[PDB]
Amino acid sequence: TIPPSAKYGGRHTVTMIPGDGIGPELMLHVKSVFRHACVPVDFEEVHVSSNADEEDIRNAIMAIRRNRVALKGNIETNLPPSHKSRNNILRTSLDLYANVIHCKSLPGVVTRHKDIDILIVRENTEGEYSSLEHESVAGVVESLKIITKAKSLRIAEYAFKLAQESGRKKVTAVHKANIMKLGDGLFLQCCREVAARYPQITFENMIVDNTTMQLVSRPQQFDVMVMPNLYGNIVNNVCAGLVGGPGLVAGANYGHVYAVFETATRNTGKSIANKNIANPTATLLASCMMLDHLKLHSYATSIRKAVLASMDNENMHTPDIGGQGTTSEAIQDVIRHIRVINGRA
Amino acid sequence: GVQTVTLIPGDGIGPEISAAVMKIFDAAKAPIQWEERNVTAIQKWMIPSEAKESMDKNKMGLKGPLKTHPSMNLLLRKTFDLYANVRPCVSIEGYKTPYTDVNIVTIRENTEGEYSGIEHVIVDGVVQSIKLITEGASKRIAEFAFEYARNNHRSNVTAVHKANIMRMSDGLFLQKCREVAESCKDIKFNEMYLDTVCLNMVQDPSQFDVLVMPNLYGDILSDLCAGLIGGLGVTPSGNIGANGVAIFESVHGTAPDIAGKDMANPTALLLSAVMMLRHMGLFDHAARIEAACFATIKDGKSLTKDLGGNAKCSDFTEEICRRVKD
Amino acid sequence: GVQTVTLIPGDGIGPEISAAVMKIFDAAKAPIQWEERNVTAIQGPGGKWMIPSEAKESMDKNKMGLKGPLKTPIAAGHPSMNLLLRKTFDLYANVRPCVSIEGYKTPYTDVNIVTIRENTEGEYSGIEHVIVDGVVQSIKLITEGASKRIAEFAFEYARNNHRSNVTAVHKANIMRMSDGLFLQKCREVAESCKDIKFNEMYLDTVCLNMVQDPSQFDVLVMPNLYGDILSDLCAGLIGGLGVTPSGNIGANGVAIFESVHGTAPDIAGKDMANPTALLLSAVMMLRHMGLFDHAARIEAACFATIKDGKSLTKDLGGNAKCSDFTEEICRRVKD
Amino acid sequence: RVEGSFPVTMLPGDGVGPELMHAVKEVFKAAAVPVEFQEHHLMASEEKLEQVLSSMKENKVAIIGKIHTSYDMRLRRKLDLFANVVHVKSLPGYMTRHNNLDLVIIREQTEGEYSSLEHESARGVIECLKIVTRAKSQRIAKFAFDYATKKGRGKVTAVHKANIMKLGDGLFLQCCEEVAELYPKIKFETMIIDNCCMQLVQNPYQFDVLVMPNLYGNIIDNLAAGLVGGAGVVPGESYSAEYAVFETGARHPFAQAVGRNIANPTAMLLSASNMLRHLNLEYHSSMIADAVKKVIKVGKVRTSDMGGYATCHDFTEEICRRVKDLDENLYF
């Protein structure tokens, strides 16, 4: 068995990978809101950006073993070999098997659709991350991907457990089982094999081609969605678009003992790095999920309620959602809406 | 003189909307005779040679629904080498969807990727998909997309890809896309991640011109656009191919719910064919058969089940047919 | 034509044996200039290792390079030098012959067979990986291109080296697609040269019969899926891996003729290391530079140095030294 | 002592098989053995394959003659025959280049070559997809060591190509070394397949038991069976969880053996005697052998391939004579 989480004296220690792009600055800010909210949390900053060696990412992975929770900015890749992807090596080698993404539409941020509120549980360990590619003969590139029964169960097990725990009703399995009959079919049955164990939660399925079409027209029709690690990221990205952009949606890779919280987008925003126009709500909401994971709900609620308040100000909207304010002002707001007295609310 | 063109109405509302186009197509006064056929499976599994014969000479085509051992569509890609899958999503002038000014063309590889796949169980509880992507099929679908861009007066061509995950396959499809684009500097060529395309698309689809993509993720990007304009009912199609053939089609399914019932919308098959004129060279009858239909809807006089109202396969059809003579 | 032929030192036993060949090549003073080199894996800039670039030249000027042993590349999980040399010069064929040494007593007395193994891909394009805990999967491939190419070569080696008939060796039951293709490319080259009888046998069928009566074969052509199994099996028939020669023929006429020893430094430097290989490995290399008369002499002196029965090496049922052997040949090349 | 007779399913097979079966029958009648054969032969409607299985579930032993001809393969799958054993042991009268050899070759035969989905990527590009797992390496490693102890063998040599197969053959030898702990009475060693083939020709006397994965097994069976005397003297057997089929040892003896009454039956009679020792009819197993091993030493009767000119029909018929009360076996 494994050593305990690094919480001694009411304070947890969590790893912080600041990452590339605007990752550094937004992470700093999180600290600023964290220190101001009087949250029992300290940040063991770990560097993960040097390229071509696993000296870098072997280190963060060990860190996360030590403390059992981390918060990351977004590593950028563009060594340049076929290789593997540093961000996914975490996900795969910590067995963070359950990317989740919450997509409530914001009330401040008005877009084409209103009233959205989706949950997007997604397989996070095989399929795409399983790919093996080789150039057998010049001009011929073959790619082998694996979808198993084990990992397809637990994400379906997780999708319902979460859907019950959250008091949601529908669950939709997204797949393209028609075109690839054997493999997506395997997945789909395993959802059925669980949707029986939870009869009160409506179960369903949908072809992914259709899902993307129903998403961009009448997307209010989805509660939970559970889908293999496939289809690129159309489903996680169409909704990120719908609710207002990548600067708002914030996701989380849970595992059995581990967890890593991050922006739902994989962007680094190297275009606007060190320019104080980077939107902080996504990252801030991330860390709110990280607080609920450490069971510090009170502080999660407080910061979150404040993160949504700031978003009601059209003045506090950053350039990605059409405004003209800055990260710094934005962060000022959210700090103005957490009022703590003797460390409370 | 006239123009002879194979044709295969299908299942469901298929033969109904099909001949409902013959009605409106001839009601335009349009030069085309329809050497009809019917494809089904015979066994080495091949389709009927009555069609296969005719269209080698008839060259073009038109199509409708089907159903499903080797499925109907698969035998049409394979035997006619229909190696590209053009599909314009331009948004209707009357039909109100929140994405108003979409105008996108989504050329797509029709020969590799999933369509070369081989699911095969490795051990109990462990499926494994082999896909392959080749050089030649990429350079060929890459070349295609600039020809299309040049011909139909397009400005941008963006390769869509996901070399995050499939570094090697999409990295070679990108290699061959560039080679092509460095021979056609008239066209603005950029590459975008598949993630980012769906992020931008739903946010502001107006920045998108021609999109060329391998077939690894295939259909999903094209259908997402269709969601933007209003549905699969109004979405055209087309499968340019090697011999010189080019089967146009409608993308909706069998439609068994209201098979007869006079309840169907043909704007698919119509605009599938307004594309056929343009391939064939009849631009002048084109803009007629087209603008007659966008006004048919813009007015709002009638609207079938897909668009909502009460009109039938016949009520809408003749309602365009008379508008075309004007 | 006073030719230059590059000579890799050979690590471990290589020094004793390489210079043993040189000194025995002094005895008949063949027109050979020994442009020494070495191919210790070096790491190339773009990422993947590259060879020493004076060798990549010395052998791209001169065309025959005679190799020796290769220090086992166990230093780290990096490319094996043997793999570099074969890939660099694209040597697509490995030809190892097996003749019964008349001196050496071994149960199989009438053996004269040659095993041509296709050396492009197959086993040598090895991609093993993992699918779940304890479920490795291997991916090997056989290509029609280099199938015909070794089917071509192989008949050519019969005609060129005056060899009655040819046997393609395979497993067209177990793996019908991969070998049926490799057969097929041999069947087409059979019609081309119908002066050479062509049969097909199973890998199994061969092994069973060659161990009972090895006389019946003489050239065997076989893809790389099986590897040195069949060739190393014969080595035993004539007795020893140190009396059998090997040579990688390549495209553009380039070619490295080598021994197939190991790197056991135990008696290496004990002046007792049998060099009977690289010598016969070069007797091939002379025969590949038209030097038929300069090689048939080197050889029969080595065959009747062994048939001698006193000036042997300890690896072949004796007690003496590599120094006694090399010189007993040296006096017998002068007759 | 044996009321009735043990039922043994027999597929005679195509070619010189039935003729060899008939030899097993005649030497069995002569021998006074309580065994009853029942036979189902073997492509139109393969109902026979389940007709055979049913029998196989009832009897759970068999004798086969190698359907010359997925036929054979689908049968072994349905039975889950995972272990194959070839007994390479020189007969005493029958001299070869390697005499007084006693070896036993256990090869895996559920995976490896016997899976290997093969497909085409480009015109002229074929691809092989072999699978090695720990489930089935452990299984055959257990069998070998269990067998090695049951038969009193002192050494197991695991044959591998872990030089080139870094992982897969690596994986195999892990299970062998894991299993080798349980049996500390048994010397364990590994050997490379290229090296082992050469060692098998030079000093084959160095081995006891050889356990190897599938690729290399089909090859070493025949390579070994050559040392000992050829394809008609070497017997073998295959083992399911609950099943057992007995047969000839060398797999592809000849492209064509056409011509009646010339094939040597020593393989089946010795396989068949080994079959009896499975049915725990130990004394008849020890007398059908002793007769066959003693018609060989007498040298009078031999088959074309072993030396003489005597036919199948007369090489058989001299064995019965030797079983039929003309055997001593009084050493206890």
Residue numbers in the entry:
A (entry chain B): 5 to 82, 85 to 351
B (entry chain A): 3 to 45, 50 to 74, 80 to 337
C (entry chain C): 3 to 337
D (entry chain D): 10 to 51, 57 to 83, 93 to 355
What's written in the study?
The crystal structure of the β-mutant HsIDH3 was solved at 3.47 Å resolution with each asymmetric unit containing one α2βγ heterotetramer. There are no ligands bound at the active sites, the allosteric site, and the pseudo allosteric site; thus, this structure represents the apo HsIDH3. In the apo HsIDH3 structure, the αβ and αγ heterodimers assemble the α2βγ heterotetramer via their clasp domains, and two α2βγ heterotetramers assemble the (α2βγ)2 heterooctamer through insertion of the N-terminal of the γ subunit of one heterotetramer into the back cleft of the β subunit of the other heterotetramer. Thus, the heterotetramer has a distorted tetrahedron architecture with the two α subunits occupying two vertices on the same side and the β and γ subunits two vertices on the other side. At the interface, the clasp β-sheets of the two heterodimers interact with each other to form a β-barrel in a reciprocal manner such that the clasp β-strands of the β subunit stack antiparallelly onto those of the α subunit of the αγ heterodimer, and the clasp β-strands of the γ subunit stack antiparallelly onto those of the α subunit of the αβ heterodimer. Specifically, the two β and two γ subunits are arranged alternately to form the inner core, and the four α subunits are positioned on the periphery. In particular, residues 10–14 (AKYGG) of the γ subunit make several hydrogen-bonding interactions with residues of the back cleft of the β subunit, which form a major part of the heterotetramer–heterotetramer interface. Structural analysis reveals that the insertion of the N-terminal of the γ subunit into the back cleft of the β subunit pushes the large domain of the β subunit to rotate away from the α subunit (the structure elements moving away from the α subunit by about 1.5–3 Å). Consequently, the αβ heterodimer assumes an open overall conformation similar to that of the αMgγ structure rather than the compact conformation of the αCaβ structure.
